[PDB]
Design a protein around this nucleic acid. Sequence first.
DNA 1: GGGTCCGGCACTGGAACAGGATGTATATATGTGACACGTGCCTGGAGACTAGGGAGTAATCCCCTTGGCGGTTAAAACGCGGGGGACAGCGCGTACGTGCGTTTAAGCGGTGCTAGAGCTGTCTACGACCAATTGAGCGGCCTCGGCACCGGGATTCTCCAGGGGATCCGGATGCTC
DNA 2: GAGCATCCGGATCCCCTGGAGAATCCCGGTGCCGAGGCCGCTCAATTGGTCGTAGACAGCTCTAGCACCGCTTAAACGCACGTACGCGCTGTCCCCCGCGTTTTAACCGCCAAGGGGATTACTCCCTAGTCTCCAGGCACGTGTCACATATATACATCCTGTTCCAGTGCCGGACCC
Lengths: 95, 95, 109, 109, 75, 83, 83, 97, 97
Amino acid sequence: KRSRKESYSVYVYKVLKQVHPDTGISSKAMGIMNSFVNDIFERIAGEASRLAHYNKRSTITSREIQTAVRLLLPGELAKHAVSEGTKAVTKYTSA
Amino acid sequence: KRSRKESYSVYVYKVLKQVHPDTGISSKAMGIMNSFVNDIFERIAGEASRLAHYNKRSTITSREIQTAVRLLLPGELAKHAVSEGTKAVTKYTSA
Amino acid sequence: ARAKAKTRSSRAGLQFPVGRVHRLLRKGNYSERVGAGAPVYLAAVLEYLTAEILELAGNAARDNKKTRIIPRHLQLAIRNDEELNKLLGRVTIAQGGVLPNIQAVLLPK
Amino acid sequence: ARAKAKTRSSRAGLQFPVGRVHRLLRKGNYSERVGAGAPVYLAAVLEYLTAEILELAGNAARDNKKTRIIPRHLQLAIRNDEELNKLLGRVTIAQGGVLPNIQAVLLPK
Amino acid sequence: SGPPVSELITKAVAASKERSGVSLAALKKALAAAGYDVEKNNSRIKLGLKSLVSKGTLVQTKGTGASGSFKLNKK
Amino acid sequence: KVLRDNIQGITKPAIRRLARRGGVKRISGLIYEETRGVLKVFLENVIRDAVTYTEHAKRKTVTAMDVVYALKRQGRTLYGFGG
Amino acid sequence: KVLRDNIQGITKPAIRRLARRGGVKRISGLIYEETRGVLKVFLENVIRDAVTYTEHAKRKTVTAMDVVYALKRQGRTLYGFGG
Amino acid sequence: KPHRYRPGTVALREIRRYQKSTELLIRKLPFQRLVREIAQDFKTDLRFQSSAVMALQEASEAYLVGLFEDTNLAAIHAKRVTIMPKDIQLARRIRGE
Amino acid sequence: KPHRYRPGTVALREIRRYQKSTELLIRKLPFQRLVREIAQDFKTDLRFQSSAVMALQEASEAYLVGLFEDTNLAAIHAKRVTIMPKDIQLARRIRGE
DNA sequence: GGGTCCGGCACTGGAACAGGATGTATATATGTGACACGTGCCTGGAGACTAGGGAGTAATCCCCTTGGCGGTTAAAACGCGGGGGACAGCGCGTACGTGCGTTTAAGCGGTGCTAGAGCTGTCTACGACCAATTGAGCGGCCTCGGCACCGGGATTCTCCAGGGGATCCGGATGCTC
DNA sequence: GAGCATCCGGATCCCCTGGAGAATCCCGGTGCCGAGGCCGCTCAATTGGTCGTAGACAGCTCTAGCACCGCTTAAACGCACGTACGCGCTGTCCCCCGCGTTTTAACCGCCAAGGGGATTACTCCCTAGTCTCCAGGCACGTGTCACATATATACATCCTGTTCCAGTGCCGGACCC
C-alpha cells in the first residue's frame, strides 16, 4: 500500500505534444520541470501574497497577479504573458 | 481627528530605558528601528510559514519559531536567543 | 439530473489544471480569499513559460539530433536566452552543465 | 467577576508587545492558527535583538561624546560587529554612510 | 675607499659573455655574489649603466633605457 | 514640460565625492558615463517596479512606501523610510 | 564509524576537473587548500541548515527535499530533487 | 610661491571628510528632475512625495557606493590605484547584473 | 622522441571535453564520506538517502564551478592566466559572504 | 705602413609549409531499460445554492504636492600646471603541465538486517471565536536643553628649505721603466 | 724624466632633518527646535467559556540504507623534463588632481492654487462552504525502440622537420693619416 503523490506530469507531456508531437523527454528533466512549475508558482504566488497584504486587501485578484507577472518577469515575457492571460480569462468568462 | 498608524516606537524607547537610562534617540533612527522590527518580523514569519507548510503543519508553534531563530540568526545570537526565549516561555506558562 | 462534467481548464482551453492550482493557492495561505480569474491567469502564464522553454529545448535537441530531452538541452535552453537568464539567474539545473564559454585570452595565438 | 486586566508581556516578563505580535501574525496569513508560545518567543527574540543593537548604539554614542543616538551610530554599531553584519549585510541605513575604511596601499610611505 | 661600481659592472659583463647581453637582474645578482649593497643603490646602478652606455664602452642589445640586456663593445 | 538631458545633472564632482565615499583615490575620465549608465539602469529598474506598484494602487503619485517595497523585492531593502 | 581525514578525500585532479568546468586555463598548486576550505564552509552552512530542518521534523534521516530546501533559502537553488 | 599639496593627499583628506560624515552628497533637485524624466517614459503625469524621492536618492548612493568599494577592491587587485570602467564591468558581472 | 603536446592545449581539450560533458564529476564515495564527516559534528548518528547525497554533490559542484568562472574573470582582470588564492578571496568578498 | 672604417658573406635565428600521430568526430551494429502506453480506481474536481462579506464607487476636503519669483552664494565649470601612475618590454626564475609508470581504492555486483519512514487509529490538549470591557498606546501640544551653527586658539599633517653622508671626479704623488 | 698607477681630497647629488603654513581638533558661546513628557481619547487586548479539531503518540509494516565482501580496473599519485608565465623593474608618455577664477543655478524662503489621498457611506458582486457525484491522473504492469556502448574509418589539429629569409658578427678590402 502506497500514498499517491501529486505532480504536474501529464500536463507538461500534453504541452510538449502540442509544441512538438515527435519528441521525448528524460524522467530527470521531467523532475526538473515539475520542480520548475512548483518554484515559479511559489515565486508568483508569494509576490501576490505580499501585494495583497500591502494595500490592506484580503482578496487576491487577477489584477495583482498581472502586477506580479509584470513585476517578476522582465521585458518580452511579461507582455506575452498578459496577452494570453487576458484572452484566456475572457474565454473563461465567455463560457 | 485621524485614523491611527500602528508603530513600535515607545517599546524601543522603554528598552532604551532598560539598557541605557541616560541616553537619547533620534526620530530618524526610531523609524529605522520600526523598519528593523518589521523586517526581522516578516523574515521570521515567512520562515515560520515555510516550516509549517513543509511538515504539513498548519499551527505556528513555538518549536519551529525556535528552529527558524536558529536558522536565520548566526551562532551566538541564535543560542542566546534560544536561551532567553526559553526563559520567557517558561515564565509565560507559569503565568 | 445534473450537468455534464466539464473541467474549467477545458472551458478556458488551457492545459495545466486550473482547479489544482486553485486548491494549491487555497491551502498555501497566500490569501484569505481568492478570486476566480487569478488561477486561470496563472495557469496561462505557466503554460506560456513552459511552451517557450520546451520549444527552445526541442530546437536544442534537434540540434543535438536526439529525439528526447536531456537536462543538458534544458540547461542550454534556459541559459542561451538572456531574458530567461534574468528570470532564473541564481539557479543551477541538476546534470545541466554550462554553456560553451571560453575566453579569447585562453585561446592560442 | 472578571479578573484584573494584566498584560501578557508582563506575565512573560517582557517589554515588547506580545499581544500586538500575536495579532500581526494572526492577520499576517502564515498559518491557519498560531500557538500561544510562538508570539512570546518571537517578541523575546526581537527584544533581545533590539537590546543588542541599542546597547551597541548607546556605547557608540558615548564614544562620540553624545547622549543622542544618530543613525551614523547605528552604522558604527552594526557594521563593526561581524555577526550582526551577517544578519544585515544586504541592508542600508538612510543617512548612515559607511565606516572609515582605507586600503593599505592607499596611504603614502 | 673601494673601486666604484663601473669596474664591477665591466667584470660582471665579462664574467659570462654569452651570445646575448647580460641582463639587469643578472648583473644585480653578480654584484650581490661578488659583494655589494644592491638594495640601496638602484638609482646608482641605473645612472652608472646609463653613463657607461653613453660613452659607448658597452652597447645595448635589445631594451630601452635601463631595461633589456647589456653587452660589451666591438673592441 | 518634457525633459531630455538630466543624466548630465548628476555632475562630475558629485560622482567624485561618491567615489571618496567608496574610498576611490583617483578617477579616470571614462568612469563618469559608465557610472551614469549603471545609475540609469538601477534607477529605471526600481522605478518601473514602483510605478507598477502605483498602478496596482490606482494612484498617480509615487509614494515612499512603494519605493521601499520595490527595493525590498529587488534585494536591497532600505531602512529609514518604512511607515 | 569515526571519520577524521576525509577533507583530503576530494582529490587534486577533481579540483582540476572542476576548474576545467569553470574555464580555468592554468591552475596554481596553492589553490587547493583554500578551495577545500571554502568547500567545507559551504557544506557546513548547508548541512547546518539541513540538520535544523530535519531535527524540526524529529527525523534522524535527512532527505533530498531538505537539501534543496536549505539551498533554496540560501539563494543557491538547484532543481530536480522533489523541490 | 603659493603652497600646493601633492595629489592624493588632499584626496585622502576629503575621503576621510565625507567618510566620517553622514550627509547627502548628490544635489537633490537635478537628481529629482532625473527621477521625473525616467518616470516620464513609462506613464505620464506622475507625482512624487519629497520623502519618496529622497528615499530613492539614498538608495541611489547606496548602490553606487557599494559598487564603488567593489570596484576599489577590483582596482587594487590589479596592483593599481586608478579606476577604469573595465573594473566596473567586472563588478557588475560578479554581482549578477 | 615520443610525442608530447605543449602545455595548456591538453588543458583546453579537457575544458572542451568536460564542459561538453554532463556527468557527475567528483568521486561519489569519498565525498559522501566527507559529508558524513562534517555531519557527525552537529548531530550524531545522521543517515543519508542517496539522492540527497547526489543533490549535495551537484550543489557543491555548482557553487565551486561558479566561483571558478568568477576567478577566471579575476585572472583576466589582473592580466593573468593563473588564479591565486587572493582571486578566490576577493570573489568571496564581492559576493558578500 | 699602420689604423680605422666600410661592405659582404656565411653562420645562425627566426618565419612559411608539408607531413605524421593522434584524438576527436562519423558510420554501423546491438541490446536494454527507461520511455511510453494501457488499466483500475478513487479521490479531487466540479455543479448548485446559500451566506455573507470585501470591495467598487460617489463624495469631500485638505493638505500636501506642484508651479512660480527673488537673492546668495556654494558648487559647478573651465583652464594651467604638474606630477603620479599606466602600461609595455624584457628577462629570469620558477611552478605547474603533461606524459610516463604504480597503487589503490572507487566502482560494481551481491546479500543480509534492520531502523526508521511512513501509514493508520486515538484522543487529548489546545487554539479559534466571540460578548464585554477596560488600560495601554497613540495623536495633540508645549516646553528646554542638547545640540547645530559661530567663533577663537593648538595641534598635527604636509611640504619645502637648509645640513650630512656617499660618490664620482680631478689633481697630487711615487714608482718604475 | 715622464707616463701611468694610485691615493686622497674636493664638488656634487641624494638622503635627512627643522620650520612655516594650514586644515582640522578642540574649547567656549547662543539661540533654536526636536524631543520628552503631560493629557485626552478610544480600541485592541484580555478573560472566560465553548467547540471543534489537529497534532502527539502507540503500534505495525516494509524499504531502502547500512554493513559486509569479492573482483576489477580508472584514476590517484608521484616524479621528471620541460616550457610557459608572474612579476620586478624601469622608461616613457600621458592623463588626471589641485588650485584658482568666473559663472550659475541650488537652496531657501515666500506665496498661490489645486489634485488626488484618504477616508466614509452605501449597496452589490463575488466567492468560500457544503453536499453530492463522477471522471482524469497516478500507481502498476508491460513492451519495445532511441540511445549507450562497441567497433571500424576519416579528418582536423597540432607539433615538428625542412626550407627559405633576415640579421649580424667576423673577415676582407679600401681609405686616410
